[PDB]
Amino acid sequence: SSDMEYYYKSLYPFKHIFNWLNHSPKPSRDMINREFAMAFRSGAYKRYNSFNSVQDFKAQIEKANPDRFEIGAIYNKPPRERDTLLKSELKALEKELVFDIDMDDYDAFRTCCSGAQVCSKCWKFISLAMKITNTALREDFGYKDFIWVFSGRRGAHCWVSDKRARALTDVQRRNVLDYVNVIRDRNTDKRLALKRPYHPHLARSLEQLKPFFVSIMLEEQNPWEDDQHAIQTLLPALYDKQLIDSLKKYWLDNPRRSSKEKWNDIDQIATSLFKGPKQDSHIIKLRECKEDLVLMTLYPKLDVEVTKQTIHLLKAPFCIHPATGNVCVPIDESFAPEKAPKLIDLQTEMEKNNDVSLTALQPFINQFQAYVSSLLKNELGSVKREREDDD
Amino acid sequence: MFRQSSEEEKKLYARLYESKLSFYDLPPQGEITLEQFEIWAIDRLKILLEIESCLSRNKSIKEIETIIKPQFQKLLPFNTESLEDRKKDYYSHFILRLCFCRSKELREKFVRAETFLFKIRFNMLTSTDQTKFVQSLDLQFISNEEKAELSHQLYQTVSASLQFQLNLNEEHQRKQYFQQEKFIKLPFENVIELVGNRLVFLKDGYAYLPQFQQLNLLSNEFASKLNQELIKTYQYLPRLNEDDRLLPILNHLSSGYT
């Protein structure tokens, strides 16, 4: 508890977070009416907090001293005044569009680690997921005011703060989520449901993921070296029963062939089976199955519960993870979890230097400050364009 | 070469039904009877009750059309020149505004049923009538250069839809149709239901929509404007309370939905 008190009093960037959530140096409804929730070591959890200013925000989080606090929607009236309101009178107006990716969703194909454990070998899943998502957010939706945040142990959170993104309704959020959710079923015993020819989003994502399929899936992770795992995850994605039976029989006679070897066996056995006039069609179908496998293995996997409602609460940036001790820092695609700071290490560094700018947390604070500066500039430009359009 | 050279209410309803459908845009005038008020409201209410019943039974558009179309000739005629039918349709809609503006649940049910009836009747139109009706509502197409630059992405987006929705199984036919097809550009938030199904192409925050689609925008505008008009209708219900002879009828009409 004392370490958390020291963290909020010495290290947490309240000013930058206030500028991000308020969208203004001076106070506004975007902070006054924003819900915050606090989680405590006693097991208690308190909703519907909101803060009048950066000083009030900092003072209340310091005074409460939670393990973590979570960010919710902007409301029509202050959530801290809910005792003056009926439950139907307090209503949401905006929240940042948030996406959540977890490493545990890739355990169908990850091998080097499993569960909430992580390493730089498997974080390439998250890096590619971030890359595909960023391409979608910029090229498809036109967003610019977004930032990625490490969950502290096993995932990454993207906080989109563009004004049009903040204003999305629950129905609109669910449909945006559906647009970016491609692998809508996680079970491995079927080929993907995607229609052909590909929508341009799918085609571009596939072309972005193709150069990394060999190195990550077939060589680094190599999940299909186990024959039973290949029979349970690789073969059901193929289009033909005779091909599946031939591969199963061949691998049971010739066990423990690597994922790369099995990937080549698919082509070789298909070429041996599908001779004659229909050979081009069978080759096309086989290629479709392999393309769908690339998407099935490397495309972003998302927690729908974080995105599908405006009122949802999620662990704020620069929080401390209770088990690992890591800071929930901002990140980019080149990140790995081994690069995250820890509370004990930051306390040690502050004891040695007595200056946050000389700790390992300052590069992440620099990233967040640059993001906030860009966000505020774009907000002011949007207000100027709206005023000129109104004039 | 050779060359040569109240009534207002009737003209109003002729104008309102020249398009064969209406957004129900304008205040009625003149008089009808109280028996007509009750019966016309009940007729439209019966059609909307069956629409909501079929939707609660999860029946498709084709099934609902098969169920509802025989009922127009008996309860609420459509594609008709008769002034009586046109007044019956218009007035019955306006009556059920006053019945169903009363609460959020009633407003939602009435908007849903009436918008689905709007969809049904729009499907009954010829393409010329649809075009004229859309043009009458004062409802941006992309340039040929922009279509050419985005042609690969747009064709990849619509090629499956051309095969399944317009039955164009031949790729040659799809290419010819695509060469003749127009596209609309608007913000992606306006067509988000098509976005979630990946039926439209997205670029820089704008959705690219082919002309053979987009009826959901028309019906959503109908639903939104009807919801706003119902909210307005709710705000001036205290003026309805000046004639007692109408309140039992409206209570009876709303009781079948509660």
Chain centroid to Cα A25, Å, comes to 28
Residues shown for chain A: 391
Asked whether A142 and B205 are in contact (CB, 8 A), the reply is yes
Assign A181 to helix, strand or coil: coil
Cα separation, A60 vs A315, in Å, equals 17
Residues shown for chain B: 258
Any residues with CB less than 8 A from the CB of B123 and at least 6 apart, and which?
Answer: B61, B65
Q: Which of B192, B204, B220 to mutate to test the interface with A (most CBs of A within 10 A)?
A: B192
How many Cα neighbours within 13 Å face the side chain of A391? Answer: 6
Residues of chain B found within 8 Å of residue A139, distances taken between Cβ atoms:
203-204
Contact between chains at A140 and B202 (C-beta distance less than 8 A): yes
- Transcribe A85-124 into DSSP letters: S-TTT--EEE--EEEEEEGGGGTTT--S--TT---TTTTH
Residue type, B228: Q
Cα dist. A71→A330, A361, A366, B91 in Å? 15, 21, 21, 50
Query: Looking at chain A, which residue has its C-alpha nearest residue B198?
Result: A179
DSSP code, position A199:
P
Chain centroid to Cα A55, Å, comes to 30
* Tokens at A315, concatenated: 């662990």
Residues of chain A found within 8 Å of residue B192, distances taken between Cβ atoms:
171-172, 175-176
Nearest to A58 by CA among A13, A27, A97: A13
Cα separation, A264 vs B165, in Å, equals 38
Asked whether B76 and B117 are in contact (CB, 8 A), the reply is no
Asked whether A259 and A218 are in contact (CB, 8 A), the reply is yes
CA triple A177-A178-A184, angle to 5 deg: 115
Q: Which helix (H) or strand (E) holds A36?
A: strand A34-39
Instruction: Return the axis-axis angle of helices A279-298 and A124-135, rounded to nearest 10°.
Output: 100
Find where tokens 């204003």 sit: A167
Query: Looking at chain B, which residue has its C-alpha nearest residue A200?
Result: B153
Cα separation, A171 vs A175, in Å, equals 6
Nearest to A314 by CA among A152, A79, A125, A143: A152
Any residues with CB less than 8 A from the CB of B187 and at least 6 apart, and which?
Answer: A164, B205, B206, B207
Asked whether A134 and A140 are in contact (CB, 8 A), the reply is no
Nearest to A9 by CA among A63, A67, A82, A54: A63
Contact between chains at A172 and B206 (C-beta distance less than 8 A): no
How many Cα neighbours within 13 Å face the side chain of B153? Answer: 20
* Tokens at A163, concatenated: 């004004």
Asked whether A324 and A309 are in contact (CB, 8 A), the reply is no
Contact between chains at A178 and B204 (C-beta distance less than 8 A): no
Residues of chain B found within 8 Å of residue A199, distances taken between Cβ atoms:
156-157, 198, 201
* Tokens at B58, concatenated: 């999860």
Closest-CA distance, A353 to chain B, in angstroms, reads: 46
Sheet holding A155-160: strands in order across?
A97-102, A155-160, A146-150, A330-331
Burial label for A256, CB within 10 Å (0-12, 13-18, 19+), is exposed
DSSP code, position A233:
I
Active-site residue, from A94, A96, A102, A291: A102
**Is A207 an 8 Å CB contact of chain B?**
no
Residue A69 backbone dihedrals phi, psi, to 5 degrees: -135, 155
Beta bridge partners of B210: B183
**Is the peptide bond preceding residue A322 cis, with omega within 30 degrees of 0?**
no
Any residues with CB less than 8 A from the CB of B250 and at least 6 apart, and which?
Answer: B98, B99
Beta bridge partners of A100: A157
* Tokens at A66, concatenated: 């939670």
Helices and strands (DSSP H and E) totals, chain A: 15, 9
Residue B204 backbone dihedrals phi, psi, to 5 degrees: 55, 35
Cα separation, A317 vs A346, in Å, equals 16
| B78 CB neighbour count, 10 Å cutoff | 18
Cα separation, B253 vs B44, in Å, equals 10
* Tokens at B215, concatenated: 């009826």
Chain centroid to Cα A109, Å, comes to 18
Chain centroid to Cα B178, Å, comes to 27
How many Cα neighbours within 13 Å face the side chain of A87? Answer: 0
Cα separation, A125 vs A183, in Å, equals 14
Q: Which helix (H) or strand (E) holds B203?
A: strand B201-203
DSSP code, position A76:
S
Q: Which helix (H) or strand (E) holds B184?
A: strand B183-187
How many Cα neighbours within 13 Å face the side chain of B225? Answer: 13
Nearest to B85 by CA among B173, B20, B157, B129: B20
Any residues with CB less than 8 A from the CB of A295 and at least 6 apart, and which?
Answer: A182, A183, A192, A194, A202, A205, A206, A209
Active-site residue, from A30, A94, A100, A349: A100
Residue A95 backbone dihedrals phi, psi, to 5 degrees: -155, 145
Residue type, A375: L
**Rounded to a whole number, what is the distance in angstroms from the first to the last CA of chain A?**
54
Beta bridge partners of B206: B187, B203
Beta bridge partners of A69: A38
Closest-CA distance, A93 to chain B, in angstroms, reads: 16
| Residue A100 designated active-site | yes
Any residues with CB less than 8 A from the CB of B13 and at least 6 apart, and which?
Answer: B83, B86, B87, B90
Method: cryo-EM
Dihedral, A57, A36, A13, A162 alpha carbons, nearest 10 = -120
Q: Which helix (H) or strand (E) holds A307?
A: helix A304-307
**What pairing do the DSSP bridges indicate for beta strands A68-75 and A92-94?**
antiparallel
Helices and strands (DSSP H and E) totals, chain B: 13, 3
Dihedral, A107, A113, A119, A121 alpha carbons, nearest 10 = -70
Asked whether B48 and B113 are in contact (CB, 8 A), the reply is yes
Which spans in A120-169 are helix H? 124-135, 163-166
